[PDB]
Design an enzyme around this catalytic site. Sequence first.
Site, PDB file in Angstrom:
ATOM      1  N   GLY A  43       0.843  -1.176   0.000  1.00 25.22           N
ATOM      2  CA  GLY A  43       0.000   0.000   0.000  1.00 25.22           C
ATOM      3  C   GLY A  43       0.883   1.230   0.000  1.00 25.22           C
ATOM      4  N   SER A 110       6.405  -4.574  -2.417  1.00 27.30           N
ATOM      5  CA  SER A 110       5.934  -3.227  -2.697  1.00 27.30           C
ATOM      6  C   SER A 110       6.203  -2.314  -1.493  1.00 27.30           C
ATOM      7  CB  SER A 110       4.445  -3.293  -3.016  1.00 27.30           C
ATOM      8  OG  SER A 110       4.105  -2.320  -3.978  1.00 27.30           O
ATOM      9  N   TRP A 111       5.195  -1.595  -1.005  1.00 30.83           N
ATOM     10  CA  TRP A 111       5.410  -0.744   0.165  1.00 30.83           C
ATOM     11  C   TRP A 111       5.923  -1.637   1.291  1.00 30.83           C
ATOM     12  CZ3 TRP A 111       6.200   3.206   3.280  1.00 30.83           C
ATOM     13  CH2 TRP A 111       5.907   3.052   4.646  1.00 30.83           C
ATOM     14  N   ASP A 265       6.814  -4.357 -14.198  1.00 32.38           N
ATOM     15  CA  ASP A 265       6.149  -3.841 -13.011  1.00 32.38           C
ATOM     16  C   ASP A 265       5.934  -2.350 -13.296  1.00 32.38           C
ATOM     17  OD1 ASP A 265       6.840  -4.124  -9.439  1.00 32.38           O
ATOM     18  OD2 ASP A 265       5.487  -2.764 -10.516  1.00 32.38           O
ATOM     19  N   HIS A 293       3.561  -6.224 -11.573  1.00 34.66           N
ATOM     20  CA  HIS A 293       3.883  -5.902 -10.184  1.00 34.66           C
ATOM     21  C   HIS A 293       3.411  -6.891  -9.111  1.00 34.66           C
ATOM     22  CE1 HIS A 293       4.709  -3.450  -6.691  1.00 34.66           C
ATOM     23  NE2 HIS A 293       3.431  -3.405  -6.363  1.00 34.66           N
TER      24      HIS A 293
HETATM   25  C1  LIG Z   1       3.305   1.167  -3.546  1.00 34.24           C
HETATM   26  C2  LIG Z   1       2.187   0.175  -3.899  1.00 34.24           C
HETATM   27  N1  LIG Z   1       0.936   1.010  -3.940  1.00 34.24           N
HETATM   28  C3  LIG Z   1       2.044  -0.991  -2.896  1.00 34.24           C
HETATM   29  O1  LIG Z   1       2.764  -1.089  -1.912  1.00 34.24           O
HETATM   30  C4  LIG Z   1       1.027  -2.008  -3.181  1.00 34.24           C
HETATM   31  N2  LIG Z   1      -0.312  -1.936  -3.317  1.00 34.24           N
HETATM   32  N3  LIG Z   1      -0.783  -3.140  -3.572  1.00 34.24           N
HETATM   33  C5  LIG Z   1       0.236  -4.036  -3.609  1.00 34.24           C
HETATM   34  C6  LIG Z   1       0.301  -5.531  -3.850  1.00 34.24           C
HETATM   35  C7  LIG Z   1       1.156  -5.821  -5.077  1.00 34.24           C
HETATM   36  C8  LIG Z   1       0.915  -6.214  -2.625  1.00 34.24           C
HETATM   37  C9  LIG Z   1      -1.117  -6.055  -4.088  1.00 34.24           C
HETATM   38  O2  LIG Z   1       1.433  -3.348  -3.362  1.00 34.24           O
END
Ligand SMILES: C[C@H](N)C(=O)c1nnc(C(C)(C)C)o1
Length: 313
Positions: A43, A110-111, A265, A293
Amino acid sequence: LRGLYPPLAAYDSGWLDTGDGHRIYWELSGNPNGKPAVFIHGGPGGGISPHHRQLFDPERYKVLLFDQRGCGRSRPHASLDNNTTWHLVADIERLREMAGVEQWLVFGGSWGSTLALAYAQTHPERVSEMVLRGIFTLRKQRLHWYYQDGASRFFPEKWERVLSILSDDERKDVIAAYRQRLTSADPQVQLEAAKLWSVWEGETVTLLPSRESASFGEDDFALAFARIENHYFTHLGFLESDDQLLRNVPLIRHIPAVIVHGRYDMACQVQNAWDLAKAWPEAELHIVEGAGHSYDEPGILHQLMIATDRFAG
Ligand SMILES: C[C@H](N)C(=O)c1nnc(C(C)(C)C)o1
């Protein structure tokens, strides 16, 4: 290709009062006598889901999964108070002590890779190994790529929807423009912006389109997701410097790590994974061809399963 382990219910869960206004949801899964691991969701504000339990061998791992402040089952929902990178790092410790874990493997995508790096660089001695996916270091170039000009050129028809509610002046700084809407007193204004912001990401996180991206539009999820994400980006992840995370890599080069990143990604460019690997030679890098991604992209999932099984036997 390797897939997820079968579904399994958590064996314990609860809410941990932080003492400063938050009650964070956590759950333990797998084997209480297995190797300790912590799952850090993305996120920010993305939350955990049952499927994340199936990323670890139920026989060999003891997995602690938790919802970060403001999202999922953590209360208060969509709260931006005392919600910073450093409070989250502190929360991970509280959860650690509570589970009686002295040291554990950190799994983040990701985050999640971002917080994983911040956590590891703050508490090195608490990390046995790391499994990172879709590297995101929060540099301004990374934020600009995804929210101002970059990914927009691969999804022009989608980006046009994100800008539809913005005036020409607001379009020079989308993040700041959305920050105003996501924090207005009018909840209908917040929700309208939350939906657009969330769906943008839901539809650009996989190589091919998926119907599932629509779940990013659900009111509750979108509201917390958009607010929290935008809040952290507005404050540059609360870092001291642009490249703090890459600059403090020396503090964790001794920790075994695997890096998995999809070639296409669109949320986090492979460049981040390359830069990280450039500074972390010991780390094992895997650029997955034909993948986007998301963690469940066949090629990416396959490598994540191999990585967790490997650190387990
Ligand atoms: C920065 C990016 N918005 C993030 O961390 C994110 N949001 N959803 C995800 C996954 C790929 C884990 C579903 O990662």
